Structures are given as structure tokens and as C-alpha cells.
Short mmCIF file of C-alpha atoms and ligand atoms in Angstrom, two decimals:
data_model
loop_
_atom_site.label_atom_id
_atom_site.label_comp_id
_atom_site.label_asym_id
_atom_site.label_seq_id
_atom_site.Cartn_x
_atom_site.Cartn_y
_atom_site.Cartn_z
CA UNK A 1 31.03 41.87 -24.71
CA UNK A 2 31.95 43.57 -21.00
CA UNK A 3 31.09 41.94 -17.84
CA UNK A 4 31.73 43.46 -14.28
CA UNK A 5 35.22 42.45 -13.10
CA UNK A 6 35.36 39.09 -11.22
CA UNK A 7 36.72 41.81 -8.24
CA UNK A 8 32.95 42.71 -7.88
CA UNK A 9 30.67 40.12 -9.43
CA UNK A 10 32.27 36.63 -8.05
CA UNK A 11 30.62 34.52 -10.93
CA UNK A 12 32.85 35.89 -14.14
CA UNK A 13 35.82 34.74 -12.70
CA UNK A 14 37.29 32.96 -16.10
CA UNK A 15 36.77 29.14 -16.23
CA UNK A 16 39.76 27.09 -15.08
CA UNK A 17 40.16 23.93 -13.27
CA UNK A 18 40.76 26.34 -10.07
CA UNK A 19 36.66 27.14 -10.58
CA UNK A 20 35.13 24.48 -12.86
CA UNK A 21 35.47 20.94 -14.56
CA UNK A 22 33.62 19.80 -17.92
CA UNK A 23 33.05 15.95 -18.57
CA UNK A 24 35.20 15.50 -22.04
CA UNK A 25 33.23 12.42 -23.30
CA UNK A 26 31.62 11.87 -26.65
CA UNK A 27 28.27 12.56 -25.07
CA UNK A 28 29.68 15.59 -23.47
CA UNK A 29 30.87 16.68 -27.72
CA UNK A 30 26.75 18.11 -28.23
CA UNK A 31 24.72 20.48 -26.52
CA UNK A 32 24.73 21.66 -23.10
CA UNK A 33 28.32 21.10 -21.25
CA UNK A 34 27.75 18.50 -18.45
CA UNK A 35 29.67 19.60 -14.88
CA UNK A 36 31.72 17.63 -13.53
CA UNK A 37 32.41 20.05 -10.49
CA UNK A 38 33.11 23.45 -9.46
CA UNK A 39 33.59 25.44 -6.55
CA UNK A 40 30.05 26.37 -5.07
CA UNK A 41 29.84 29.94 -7.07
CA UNK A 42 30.89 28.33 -10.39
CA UNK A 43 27.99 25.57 -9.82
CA UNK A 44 25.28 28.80 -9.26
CA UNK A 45 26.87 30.85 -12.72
CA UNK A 46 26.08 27.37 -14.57
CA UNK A 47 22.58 26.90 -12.92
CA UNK A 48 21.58 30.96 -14.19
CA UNK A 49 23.52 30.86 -17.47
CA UNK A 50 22.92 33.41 -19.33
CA UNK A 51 24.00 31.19 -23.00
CA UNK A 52 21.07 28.70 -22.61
CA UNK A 53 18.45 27.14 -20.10
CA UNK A 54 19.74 23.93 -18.32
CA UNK A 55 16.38 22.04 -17.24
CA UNK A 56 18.25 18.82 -16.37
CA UNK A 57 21.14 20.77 -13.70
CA UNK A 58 18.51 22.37 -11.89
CA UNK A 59 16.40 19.37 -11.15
CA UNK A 60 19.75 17.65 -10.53
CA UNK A 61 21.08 20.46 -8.43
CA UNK A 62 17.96 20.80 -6.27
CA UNK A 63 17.78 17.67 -5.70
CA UNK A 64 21.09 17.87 -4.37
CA UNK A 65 22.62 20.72 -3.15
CA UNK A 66 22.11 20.44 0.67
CA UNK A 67 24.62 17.74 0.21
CA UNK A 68 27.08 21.06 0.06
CA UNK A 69 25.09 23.86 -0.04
CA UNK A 70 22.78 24.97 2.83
CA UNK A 71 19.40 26.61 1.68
CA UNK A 72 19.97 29.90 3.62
CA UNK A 73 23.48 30.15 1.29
CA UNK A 74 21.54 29.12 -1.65
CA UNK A 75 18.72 32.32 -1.57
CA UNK A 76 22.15 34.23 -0.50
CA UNK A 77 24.04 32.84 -3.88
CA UNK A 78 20.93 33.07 -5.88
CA UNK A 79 20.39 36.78 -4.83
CA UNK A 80 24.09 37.96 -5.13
CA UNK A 81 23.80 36.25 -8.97
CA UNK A 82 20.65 38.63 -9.14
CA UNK A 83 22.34 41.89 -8.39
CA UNK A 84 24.55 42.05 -11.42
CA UNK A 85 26.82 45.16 -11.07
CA UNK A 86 27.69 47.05 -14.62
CA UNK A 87 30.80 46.83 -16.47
CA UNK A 88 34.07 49.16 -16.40
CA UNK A 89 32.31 51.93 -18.58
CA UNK A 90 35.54 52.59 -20.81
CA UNK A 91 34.44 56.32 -20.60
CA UNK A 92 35.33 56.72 -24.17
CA UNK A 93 26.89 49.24 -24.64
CA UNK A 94 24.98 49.17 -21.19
CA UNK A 95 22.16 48.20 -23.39
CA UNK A 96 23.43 45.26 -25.15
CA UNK A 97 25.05 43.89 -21.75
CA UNK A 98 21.01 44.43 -19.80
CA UNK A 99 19.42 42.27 -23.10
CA UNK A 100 21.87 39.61 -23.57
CA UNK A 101 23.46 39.13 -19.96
CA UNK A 102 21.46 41.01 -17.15
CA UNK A 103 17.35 39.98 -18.04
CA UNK A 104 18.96 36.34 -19.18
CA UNK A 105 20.23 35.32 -15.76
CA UNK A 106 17.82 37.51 -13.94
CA UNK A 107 14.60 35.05 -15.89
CA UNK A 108 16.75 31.84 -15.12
CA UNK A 109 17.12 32.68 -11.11
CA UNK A 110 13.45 33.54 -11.28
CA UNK A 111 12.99 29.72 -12.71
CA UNK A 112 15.34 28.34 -10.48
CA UNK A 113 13.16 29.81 -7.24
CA UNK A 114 9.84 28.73 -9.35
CA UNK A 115 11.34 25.10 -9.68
CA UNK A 116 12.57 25.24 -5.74
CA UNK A 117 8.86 26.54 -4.41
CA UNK A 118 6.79 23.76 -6.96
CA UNK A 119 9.28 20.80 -5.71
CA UNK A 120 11.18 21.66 -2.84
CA UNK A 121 8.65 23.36 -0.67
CA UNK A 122 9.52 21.34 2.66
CA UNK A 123 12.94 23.46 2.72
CA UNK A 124 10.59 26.55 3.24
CA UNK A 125 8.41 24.46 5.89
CA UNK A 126 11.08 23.86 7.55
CA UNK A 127 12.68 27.56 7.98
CA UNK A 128 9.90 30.15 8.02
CA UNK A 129 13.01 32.76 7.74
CA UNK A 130 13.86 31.27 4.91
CA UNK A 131 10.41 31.79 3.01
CA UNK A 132 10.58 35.49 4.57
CA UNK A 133 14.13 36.65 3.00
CA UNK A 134 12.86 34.67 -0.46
CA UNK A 135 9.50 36.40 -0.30
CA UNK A 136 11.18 40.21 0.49
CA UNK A 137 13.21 39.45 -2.46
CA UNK A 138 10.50 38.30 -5.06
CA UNK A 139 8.44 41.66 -3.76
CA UNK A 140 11.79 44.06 -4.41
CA UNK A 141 11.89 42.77 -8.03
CA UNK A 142 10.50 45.43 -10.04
CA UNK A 143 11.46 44.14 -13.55
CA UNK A 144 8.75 44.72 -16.91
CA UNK A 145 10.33 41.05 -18.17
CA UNK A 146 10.55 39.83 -14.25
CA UNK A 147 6.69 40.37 -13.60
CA UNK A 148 4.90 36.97 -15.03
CA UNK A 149 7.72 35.12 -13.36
CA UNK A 150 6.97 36.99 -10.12
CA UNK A 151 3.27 36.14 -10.46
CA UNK A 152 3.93 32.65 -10.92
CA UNK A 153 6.04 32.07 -7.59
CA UNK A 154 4.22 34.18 -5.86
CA UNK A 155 0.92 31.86 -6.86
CA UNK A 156 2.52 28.70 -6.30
CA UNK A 157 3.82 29.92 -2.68
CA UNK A 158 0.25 30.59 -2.03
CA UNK A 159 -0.89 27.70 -3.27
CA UNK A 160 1.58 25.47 -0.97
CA UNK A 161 0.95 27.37 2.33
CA UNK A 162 -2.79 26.72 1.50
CA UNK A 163 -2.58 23.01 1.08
CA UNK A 164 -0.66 22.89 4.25
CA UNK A 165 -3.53 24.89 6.31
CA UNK A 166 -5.34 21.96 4.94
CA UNK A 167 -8.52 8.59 1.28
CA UNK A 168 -10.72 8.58 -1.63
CA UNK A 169 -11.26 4.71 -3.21
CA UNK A 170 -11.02 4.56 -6.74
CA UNK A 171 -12.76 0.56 -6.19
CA UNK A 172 -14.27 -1.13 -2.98
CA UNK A 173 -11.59 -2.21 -0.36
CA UNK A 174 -11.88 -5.57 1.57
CA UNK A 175 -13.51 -6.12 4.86
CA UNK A 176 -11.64 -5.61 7.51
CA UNK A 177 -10.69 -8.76 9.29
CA UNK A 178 -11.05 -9.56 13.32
CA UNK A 179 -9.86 -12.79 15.29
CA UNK A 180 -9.55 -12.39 18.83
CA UNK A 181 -8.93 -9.01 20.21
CA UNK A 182 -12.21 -6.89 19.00
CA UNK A 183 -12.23 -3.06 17.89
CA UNK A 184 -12.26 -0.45 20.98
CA UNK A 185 -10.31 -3.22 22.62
CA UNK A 186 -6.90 -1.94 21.88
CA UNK A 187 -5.01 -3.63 25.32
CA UNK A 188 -5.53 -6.81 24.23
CA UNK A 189 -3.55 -6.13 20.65
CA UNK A 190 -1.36 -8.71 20.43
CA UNK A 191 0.39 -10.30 17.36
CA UNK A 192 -1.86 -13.53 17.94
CA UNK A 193 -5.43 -12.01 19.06
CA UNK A 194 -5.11 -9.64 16.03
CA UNK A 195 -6.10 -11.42 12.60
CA UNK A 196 -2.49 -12.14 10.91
CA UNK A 197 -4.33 -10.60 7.07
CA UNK A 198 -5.50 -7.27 9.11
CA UNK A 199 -1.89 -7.05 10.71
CA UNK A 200 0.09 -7.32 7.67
CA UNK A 201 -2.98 -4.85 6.40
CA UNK A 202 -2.41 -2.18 8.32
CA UNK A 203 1.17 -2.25 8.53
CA UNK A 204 1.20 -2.43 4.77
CA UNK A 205 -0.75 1.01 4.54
CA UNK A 206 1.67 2.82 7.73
CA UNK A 207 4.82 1.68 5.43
CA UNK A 208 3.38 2.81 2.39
CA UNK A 209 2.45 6.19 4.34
CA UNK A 210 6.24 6.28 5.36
CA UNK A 211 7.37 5.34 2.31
CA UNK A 212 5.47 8.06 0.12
CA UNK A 213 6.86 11.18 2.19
CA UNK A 214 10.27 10.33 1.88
CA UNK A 215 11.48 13.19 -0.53
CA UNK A 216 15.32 12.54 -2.08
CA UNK A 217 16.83 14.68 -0.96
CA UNK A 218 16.93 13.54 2.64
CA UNK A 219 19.01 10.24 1.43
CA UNK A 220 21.49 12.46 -0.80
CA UNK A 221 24.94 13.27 1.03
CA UNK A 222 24.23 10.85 3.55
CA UNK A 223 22.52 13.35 5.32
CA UNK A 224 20.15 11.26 7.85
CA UNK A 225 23.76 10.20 9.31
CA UNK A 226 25.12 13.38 9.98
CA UNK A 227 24.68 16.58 12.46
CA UNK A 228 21.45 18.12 10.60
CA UNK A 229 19.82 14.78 10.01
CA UNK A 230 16.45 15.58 12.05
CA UNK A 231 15.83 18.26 9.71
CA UNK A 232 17.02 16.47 6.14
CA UNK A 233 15.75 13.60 6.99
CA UNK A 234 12.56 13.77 9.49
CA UNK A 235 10.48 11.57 6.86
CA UNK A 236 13.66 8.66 6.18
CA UNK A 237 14.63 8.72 9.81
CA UNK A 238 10.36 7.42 10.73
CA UNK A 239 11.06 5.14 8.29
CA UNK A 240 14.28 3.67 9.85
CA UNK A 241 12.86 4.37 13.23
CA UNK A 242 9.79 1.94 12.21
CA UNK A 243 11.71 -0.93 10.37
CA UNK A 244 14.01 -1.08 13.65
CA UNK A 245 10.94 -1.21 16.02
CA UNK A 246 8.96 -3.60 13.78
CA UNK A 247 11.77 -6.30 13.18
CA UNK A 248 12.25 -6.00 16.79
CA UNK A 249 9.06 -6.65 17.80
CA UNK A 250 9.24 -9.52 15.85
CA UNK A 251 11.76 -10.94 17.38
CA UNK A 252 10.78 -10.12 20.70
CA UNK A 253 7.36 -12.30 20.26
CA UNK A 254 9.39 -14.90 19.13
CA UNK A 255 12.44 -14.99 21.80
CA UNK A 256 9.86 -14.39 24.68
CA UNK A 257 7.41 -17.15 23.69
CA UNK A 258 9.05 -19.62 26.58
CA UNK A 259 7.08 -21.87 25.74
CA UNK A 260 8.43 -24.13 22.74
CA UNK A 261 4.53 -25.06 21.00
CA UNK A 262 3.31 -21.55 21.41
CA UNK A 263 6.33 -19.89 20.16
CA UNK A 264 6.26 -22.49 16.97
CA UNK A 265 2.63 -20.61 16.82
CA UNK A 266 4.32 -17.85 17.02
CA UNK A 267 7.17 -18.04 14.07
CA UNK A 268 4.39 -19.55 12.12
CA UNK A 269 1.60 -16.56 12.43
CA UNK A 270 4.90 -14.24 11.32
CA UNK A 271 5.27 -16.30 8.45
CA UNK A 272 1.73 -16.06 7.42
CA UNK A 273 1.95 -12.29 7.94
CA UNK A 274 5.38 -12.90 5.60
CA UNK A 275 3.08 -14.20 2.94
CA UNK A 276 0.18 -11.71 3.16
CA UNK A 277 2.80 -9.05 2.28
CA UNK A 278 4.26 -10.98 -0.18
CA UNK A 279 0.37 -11.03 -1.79
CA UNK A 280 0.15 -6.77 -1.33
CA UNK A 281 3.84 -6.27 -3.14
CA UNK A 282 5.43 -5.05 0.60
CA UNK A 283 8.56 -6.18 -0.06
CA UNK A 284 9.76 -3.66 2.84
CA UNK A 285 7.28 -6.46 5.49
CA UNK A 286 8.70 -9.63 3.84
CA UNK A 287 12.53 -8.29 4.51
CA UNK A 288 11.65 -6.67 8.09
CA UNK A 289 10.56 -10.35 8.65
CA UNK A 290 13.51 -12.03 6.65
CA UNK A 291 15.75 -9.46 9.24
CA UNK A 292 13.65 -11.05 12.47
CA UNK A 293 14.46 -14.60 11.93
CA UNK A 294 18.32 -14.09 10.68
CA UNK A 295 19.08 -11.90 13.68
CA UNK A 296 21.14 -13.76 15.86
CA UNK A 297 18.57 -14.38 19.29
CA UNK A 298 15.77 -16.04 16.47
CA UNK A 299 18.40 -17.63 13.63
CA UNK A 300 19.90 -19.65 16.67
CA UNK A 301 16.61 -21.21 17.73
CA UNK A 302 17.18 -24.29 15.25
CA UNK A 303 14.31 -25.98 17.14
CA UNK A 304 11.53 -23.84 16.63
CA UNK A 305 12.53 -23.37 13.05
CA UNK A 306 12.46 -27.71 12.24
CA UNK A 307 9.03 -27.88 14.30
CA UNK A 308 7.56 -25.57 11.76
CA UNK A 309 4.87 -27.18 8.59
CA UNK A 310 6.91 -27.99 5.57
CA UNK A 311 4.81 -25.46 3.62
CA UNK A 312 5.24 -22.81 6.23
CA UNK A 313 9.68 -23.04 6.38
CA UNK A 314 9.16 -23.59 2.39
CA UNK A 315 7.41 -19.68 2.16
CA UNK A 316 10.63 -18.45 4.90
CA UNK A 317 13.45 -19.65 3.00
CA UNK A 318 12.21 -18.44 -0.31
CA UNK A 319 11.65 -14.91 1.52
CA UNK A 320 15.15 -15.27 3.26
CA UNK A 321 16.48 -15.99 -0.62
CA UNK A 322 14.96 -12.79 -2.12
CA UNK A 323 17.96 -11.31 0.10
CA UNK A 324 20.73 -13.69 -1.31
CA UNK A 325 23.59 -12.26 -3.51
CA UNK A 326 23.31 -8.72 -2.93
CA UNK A 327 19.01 -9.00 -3.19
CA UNK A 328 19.36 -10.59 -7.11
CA UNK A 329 16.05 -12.27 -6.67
CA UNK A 330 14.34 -9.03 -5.00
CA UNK A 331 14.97 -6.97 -7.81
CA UNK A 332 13.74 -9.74 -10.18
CA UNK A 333 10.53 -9.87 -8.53
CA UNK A 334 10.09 -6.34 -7.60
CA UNK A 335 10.87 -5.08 -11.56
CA UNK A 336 8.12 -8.37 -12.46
CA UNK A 337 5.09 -7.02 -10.30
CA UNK A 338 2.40 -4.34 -10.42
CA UNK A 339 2.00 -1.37 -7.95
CA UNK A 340 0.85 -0.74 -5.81
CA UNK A 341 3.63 -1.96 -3.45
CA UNK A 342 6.53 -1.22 -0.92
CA UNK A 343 9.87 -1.61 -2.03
CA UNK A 344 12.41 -2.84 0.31
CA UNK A 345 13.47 0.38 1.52
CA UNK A 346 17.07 -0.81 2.87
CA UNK A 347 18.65 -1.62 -0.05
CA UNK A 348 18.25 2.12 -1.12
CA UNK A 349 20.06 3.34 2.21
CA UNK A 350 23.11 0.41 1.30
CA UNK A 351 23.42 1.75 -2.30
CA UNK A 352 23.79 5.40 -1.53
CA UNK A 353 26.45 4.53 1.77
CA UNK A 354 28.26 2.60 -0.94
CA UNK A 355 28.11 5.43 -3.32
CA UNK A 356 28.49 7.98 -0.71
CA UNK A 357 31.29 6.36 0.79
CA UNK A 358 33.44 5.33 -2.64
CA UNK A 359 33.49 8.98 -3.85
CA UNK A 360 34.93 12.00 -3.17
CA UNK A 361 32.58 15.19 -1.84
CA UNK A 362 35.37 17.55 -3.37
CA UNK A 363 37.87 17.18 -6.82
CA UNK A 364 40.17 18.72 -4.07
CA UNK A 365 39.95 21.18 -0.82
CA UNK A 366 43.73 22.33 -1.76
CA UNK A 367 43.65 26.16 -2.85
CA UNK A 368 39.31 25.88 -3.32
CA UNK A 369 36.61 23.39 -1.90
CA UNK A 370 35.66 22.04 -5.60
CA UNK A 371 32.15 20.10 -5.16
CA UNK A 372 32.54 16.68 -6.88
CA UNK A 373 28.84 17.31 -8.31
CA UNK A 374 28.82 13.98 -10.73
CA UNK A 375 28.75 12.04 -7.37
CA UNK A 376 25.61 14.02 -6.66
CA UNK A 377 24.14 13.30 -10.09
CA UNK A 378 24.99 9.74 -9.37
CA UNK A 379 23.29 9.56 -6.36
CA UNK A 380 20.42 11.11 -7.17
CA UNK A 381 19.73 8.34 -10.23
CA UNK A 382 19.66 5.85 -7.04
CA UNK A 383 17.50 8.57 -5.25
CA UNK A 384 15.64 8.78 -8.69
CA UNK A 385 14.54 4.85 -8.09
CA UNK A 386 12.39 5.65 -4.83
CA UNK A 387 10.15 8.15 -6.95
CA UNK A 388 8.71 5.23 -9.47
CA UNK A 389 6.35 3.51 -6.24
CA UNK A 390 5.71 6.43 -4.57
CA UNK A 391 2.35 7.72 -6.83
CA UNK A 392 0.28 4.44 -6.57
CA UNK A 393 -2.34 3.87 -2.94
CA UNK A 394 -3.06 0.73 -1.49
CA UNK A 395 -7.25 -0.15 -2.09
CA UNK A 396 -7.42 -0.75 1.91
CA UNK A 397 -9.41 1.09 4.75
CA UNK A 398 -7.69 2.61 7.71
CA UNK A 399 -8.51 0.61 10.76
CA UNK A 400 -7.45 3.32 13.04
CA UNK A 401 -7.00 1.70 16.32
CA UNK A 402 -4.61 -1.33 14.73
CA UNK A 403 -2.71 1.98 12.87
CA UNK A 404 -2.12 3.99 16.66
CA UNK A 405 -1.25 0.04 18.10
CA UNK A 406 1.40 -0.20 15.33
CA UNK A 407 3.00 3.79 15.15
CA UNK A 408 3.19 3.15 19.00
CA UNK A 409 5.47 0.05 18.97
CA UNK A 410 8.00 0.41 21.73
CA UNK A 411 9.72 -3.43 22.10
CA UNK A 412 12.94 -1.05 23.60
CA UNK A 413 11.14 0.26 26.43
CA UNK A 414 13.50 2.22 27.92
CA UNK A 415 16.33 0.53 27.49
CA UNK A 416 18.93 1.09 24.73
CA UNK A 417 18.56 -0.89 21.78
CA UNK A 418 22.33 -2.36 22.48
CA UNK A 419 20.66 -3.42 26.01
CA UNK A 420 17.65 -4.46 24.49
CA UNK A 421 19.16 -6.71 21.98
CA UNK A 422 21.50 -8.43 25.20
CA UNK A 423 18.31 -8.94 26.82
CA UNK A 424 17.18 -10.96 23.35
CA UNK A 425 20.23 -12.71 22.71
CA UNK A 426 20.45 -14.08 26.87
CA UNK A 427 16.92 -15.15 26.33
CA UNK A 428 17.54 -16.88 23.17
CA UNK A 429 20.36 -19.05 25.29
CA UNK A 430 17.48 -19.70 27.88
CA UNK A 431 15.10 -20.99 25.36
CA UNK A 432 17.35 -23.34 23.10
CA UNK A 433 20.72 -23.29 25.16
CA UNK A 434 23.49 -24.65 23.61
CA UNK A 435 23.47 -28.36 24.59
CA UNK A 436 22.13 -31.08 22.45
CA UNK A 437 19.32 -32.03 24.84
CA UNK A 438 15.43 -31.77 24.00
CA UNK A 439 14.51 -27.82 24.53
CA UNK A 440 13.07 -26.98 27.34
CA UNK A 441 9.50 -27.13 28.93
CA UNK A 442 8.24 -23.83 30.17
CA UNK A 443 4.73 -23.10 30.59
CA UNK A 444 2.40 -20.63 28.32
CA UNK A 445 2.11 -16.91 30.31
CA UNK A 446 -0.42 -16.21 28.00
CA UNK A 447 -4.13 -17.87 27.57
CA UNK A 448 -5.68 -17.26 24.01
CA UNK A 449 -5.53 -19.79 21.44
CA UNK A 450 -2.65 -20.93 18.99
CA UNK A 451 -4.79 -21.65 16.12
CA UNK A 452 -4.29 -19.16 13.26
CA UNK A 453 -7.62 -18.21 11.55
CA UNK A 454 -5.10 -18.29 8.05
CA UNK A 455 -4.66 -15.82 5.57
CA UNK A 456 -7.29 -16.64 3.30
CA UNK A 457 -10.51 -13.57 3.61
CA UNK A 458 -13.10 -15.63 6.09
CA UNK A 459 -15.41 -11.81 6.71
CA UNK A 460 -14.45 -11.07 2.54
CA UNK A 461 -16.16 -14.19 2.62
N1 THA B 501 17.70 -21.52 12.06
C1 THA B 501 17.01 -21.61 10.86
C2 THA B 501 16.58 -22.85 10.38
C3 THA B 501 15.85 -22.93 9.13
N2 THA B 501 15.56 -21.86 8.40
C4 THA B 501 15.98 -20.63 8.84
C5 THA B 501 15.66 -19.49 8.07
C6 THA B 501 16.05 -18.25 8.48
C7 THA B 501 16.76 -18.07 9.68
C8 THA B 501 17.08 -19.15 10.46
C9 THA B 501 16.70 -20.46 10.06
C10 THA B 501 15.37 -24.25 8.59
C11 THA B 501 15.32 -25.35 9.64
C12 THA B 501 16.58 -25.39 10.48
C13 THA B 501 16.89 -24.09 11.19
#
């Protein structure tokens, strides 16, 4: 009974659908309410309630919030919850309204910053003022009840900045395996002097790397699209950055092998590649390569693709299939394998645009901005997915000059990637024009052999 008036203490405002919207659903009839949406203050009274604990919303809305919420107004939010002022005194109580509201929502902000340090550290990484207001707070909280809680965050921030100030294998890994270009010998990296099972190798363990620092919340709110993307999304946008440079270098091997036998070499060394990720569950390699030969300056060159072994266009067009019908077959085979592995990381990005795109950020801006939040809960089952691959390494060595020759992949140049992909597509028409004459004969730039040494171990033995 008695709560400050809503004219000082923002939360109490009553519930209406000015402030706040309940699912009304059968699973919605027990328990905990589920939100629907509310305006930003109505979200943060429902994430500190003082009626019950509400594990499930703060994951969620952790997860989520910088969709509409920065992290500089959530410590602000969280810390106006925290300073409850005291009811009207009547004048002709206090103690009834510090048991059952005050220490309540004061324990479940504590959790809430306890949850936010374990699993959202990176938001304090990334703004050092940040971690200075929240740790000035924690040390003003003077609280009998609030101490243990204190301790706890105050451990676990310790514990984080540590393991910042700063491969173990569980069985052996493979040899690694050499063709022509020898270690030390980095200029003379090359898709065909380096041995096509190392290649797919080493690229297997970057994208894995990539893959495993990519937190949800920097795909949630489309946020590696918008203004404050380099800072949401710094681990997603190396990611994209990569699968860009990669497919591109593929198809730049292909479209600038002149010469029609050693490009054939060419498109079939990718292809072996294709299949050596296919054997280390990279699904994220196969597709890069399925995205190099259906661009449009390599799925034009209809010669190069008929010259290829039966076996060798039989491995492609199963690859290109996994794709088909909105990736049906992908998710078939990627549900039927066992980690470790990298899952195609595009189809993630398409879901959540869809998503993203096909809902509303507000229930309305008219009178209130009221956050749609069940989008957010919806994207963040999506964002969920990404988590279940992320805990598993591959059992292969580093080879650390092959790792700095793949990060450093620059097919662009200088140019823009609109200029670049010109340059392809007017190469492609130099290559195989369109006439129905023989293609034509252009001579080899380049001296080392065609012949793949094949995917099968020959140093494993
Ligand atoms: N252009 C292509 C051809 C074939 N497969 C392809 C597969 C992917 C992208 C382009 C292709 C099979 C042989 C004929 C041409």
C-alpha cells in the first residue's frame, strides 16, 4: 500500500495501453505476464519488479535493448529505478513500503547489473565511462541486504578486466600440409602453390575465430546497418568484411586466369577446397564458394564450367543446391552433422532483415514511443540459433603465416567494390565473350604447375 506519486517516481505511473501491453493468450493465463511492449520506463519497472523475479525478460531484454535503449540510458534508468523516493506521508507504514517495495527492486537492479557485467561485458569495453558511472554507483550503495550483491559484481568486474589484461588440444591435430609455396615464403601464397586441404584449413579456423566472437546482440535491431554499427557490431561487420573479400578473391582467381586450361585448374582447385570444407562442417566456405561461381563475371563462363571432371561439377552443383529453396537442404544437413563446424553465417543476417524489416520498432510513436519488445524477443530466438556452434574448436594447428596471408586479403585494392566488380564482369566478357565461337587462347602469366596434389592427407600420410 503507498507508492511515491508517478509526479516523482516515473515508474508507478498506472498500467494502461498509454505505458504497457500484456500478451492475452492461453500461455499468457499462468505465471509471470509476458510484455508485449511498453514505453522504455514501463519496460525497466517490469525488468526490477518488485511482485516476482523475471529470469527470462532480463536475458531477453539484455540481449536486446540497444535495439532502443542505449547503455548510457540504461545505467541512467536503472539508477533512477534505484532511488525510490517515499510516499505522501498522510501525516495522520514507511516500514512496510522499505520491506515489500524498496529492498525488492533495489535486489532485482542489483541482479540486473550482475547479469549485464557476467554476459554483456563488451558494452563496458567498449565505454570506459560507462564502467566508471556503474562502478561509482555500486560503491555509493550502502545497503545491509545490498552488500553480497555488491560483492558479487564487484568480483565479477574484476574478474573480466583481468581476463582482458590477459589453443590447448584436447586430441592430436593433423599435419600440416605444403605443395608449392614453402613456410617463411609468404610472396609466393597463391591459391595454387598453397596445398588446397591447408587452405580450406586455415580458413576454416579464421571463420570459426570470426564466427565465435560474434555476440547477439550486434545482429539485433539491425544494428550493423545503421549509424552506430562499428561499435554494435565490430565482431559481425569482420565477419561480413571477410565473406565479401573471400568470395571475391575467388572470383578474381577465376575471372583473371586468361588462360582457358589453367583457369579450368583453377575452378577445379576451388572445388576441391569446396569439398574439404564440406569434410570440416564449414558450411560458411562451401556457400562463400557457391556465392563465387553464381556471381555474374564466373556463372557466365559456361566454358570453363563444361571443361570441368564429371566428379568435380557433380560436388558444385550439389553445393550450389544446399542454397536452393530458401537453403532447405542446408538446414537438413547442418541439423544432421556433428560440431565442430561453421554455419552459413548469411542466412542469419537474411532472417533477422526479414524479421527486422516485417515488424514494427514501436506499437505506435503517437502520444508515447511504445517499444514493440515481442519483435525483440523474436529476434533474439533467431539470434538464439548462432549460440548452439559457437562452444565447440576445430582439432587443427594455427599455421600462422597462411592465417596473416588470409586476414590480409585485399582483391579490392583500392578501388570500390562497385569498381572492382566492373573490372570482373568486363573481364568475364574478355574471357568467354558472348559469341558462339571456341573461347579464346591467351597464354599462362603464371609458371607453377596445374596439377592439384588432391585433398586426400599425403604428409598425414
Ligand atoms: N555456368 C555454370 C555451369 C554449370 N554449373 C554451374 C554451377 C554454378 C554456377 C554456374 C554454373 C554446369 C555446366 C554448364 C555451366
Amino acid at each position: 500500500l503507498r507508492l511515491p506519486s508517478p509526479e516523482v517516481y516515473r515508474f508507478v505511473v498506472k498500467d494502461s495501453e498509454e505505458n504497457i501491453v500484456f500478451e492475452d493468450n492461453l500461455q499468457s493465463r499462468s505465471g509471470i505476464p509476458i510484455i508485449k511492449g511498453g514505453t522504455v520506463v514501463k519496460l525497466i519497472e517490469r525488468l526490477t519488479y518488485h511482485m516476482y523475479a523475471d529470469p527470462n525478460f532480463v536475458r531477453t531484454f539484455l540481449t536486446t535493448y540497444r535495439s532502443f535503449c542505449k547503455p548510457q540510458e540504461l545505467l541512467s534508468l536503472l539508477i533512477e529505478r534505484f532511488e525510490i523516493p517515499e510516499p505522501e506521508p498522510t501525516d495522520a507504514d514507511l516500514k512496510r513500503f522499505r520491506k515489500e517495495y524498496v529492498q525488492p527492486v533495489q535486489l532485482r537492479i542489483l541482479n540486473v547489473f550482475r547479469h549485464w557485467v557476467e554476459h554483456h561485458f563488451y558494452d563496458f569495453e567498449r565505454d570506459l565511462y560507462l564502467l566508471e558511472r556503474l562502478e561509482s554507483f555500486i560503491s555509493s550503495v550502502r545497503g545491509k541486504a545490498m552488500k553480497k550483491w555488491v560483492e558479487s559484481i564487484a568480483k565479477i568486474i574484476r574478474r573480466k578486466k583481468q581476463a582482458q589484461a590477459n589453443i590447448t588440444f584436447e586430441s592430436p591435430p593433423p599435419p600440416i600440409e605444403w605443395h608449392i609455396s614453402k613456410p617463411g615464403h609468404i610472396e609466393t601464397f597463391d591459391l595454387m602453390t598453397l596445398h588446397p586441404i591447408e587452405i580450406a584449413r586455415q580458413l576454416t579456423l579464421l571463420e570459426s575465430d570470426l564466427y565465435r566472437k560474434v555476440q547477439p546482440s550486434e545482429l539485433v535491431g539491425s544494428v550493423w546497418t545503421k549509424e552506430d554499427k562499428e561499435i554494435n557490431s565490430p565482431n559481425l561487420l569482420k565477419m561480413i568484411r571477410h565473406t565479401t573479400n573471400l568470395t571475391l578473391w575467388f572470383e578474381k582467381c577465376i575471372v583473371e586466369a586468361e588462360n582457358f586450361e589453367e583457369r579450368v585448374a583453377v575452378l577445379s582447385r576451388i572445388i576441391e577446397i569446396l569439398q574439404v570444407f564440406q569434410d570440416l562442417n564449414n558450411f560458411n566456405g562451401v556457400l562463400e564458394i557457391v556465392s563465387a561461381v553464381n556471381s555474374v563475371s564466373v556463372y557466365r563462363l559456361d566454358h570453363t564450367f563444361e571443361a570441368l571432371q564429371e566428379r568435380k561439377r557433380k560436388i558444385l552443383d550439389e553445393a550450389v543446391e544446399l542454397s536452393q529453396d530458401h537453403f532447405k537442404k542446408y538446414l537438413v544437413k547442418l541439423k544432421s552433422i556433428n560440431p565442430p563446424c561453421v554455419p552459413f553465417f548469411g542466412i542469419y543476417l537474411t532472417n533477422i532483415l526479414k524479421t527486422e524489416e516485417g515488424n514494427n520498432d514501436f506499437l505506435t510513436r503517437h502520444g508515447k514511443d511504445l517499444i514493440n519488445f515481442s519483435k525483440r524477443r523474436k529476434v533474439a530466438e533467431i539470434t538464439g540459433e548462432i549460440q548452439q556452434y559457437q562452444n565447440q574448436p576445430y582439432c587443427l594447428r594455427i599455421e600462422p603465416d597462411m592465417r596473416r596471408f588470409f586476414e590480409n586479403l585485399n582483391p579490392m585494392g583500392s578501388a570500390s567494390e562497385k569498381e572492382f566488380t566492373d573490372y570482373l564482369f568486363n573481364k568475364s566478357l574478355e574471357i568467354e565473350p558472348r559469341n558462339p565461337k571456341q573461347p579464346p587462347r591467351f597464354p599462362r602469366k603464371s609458371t607453377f604447375s596445374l596439377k592439384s596434389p588432391g585433398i586426400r592427407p599425403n604428409t598425414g600420410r
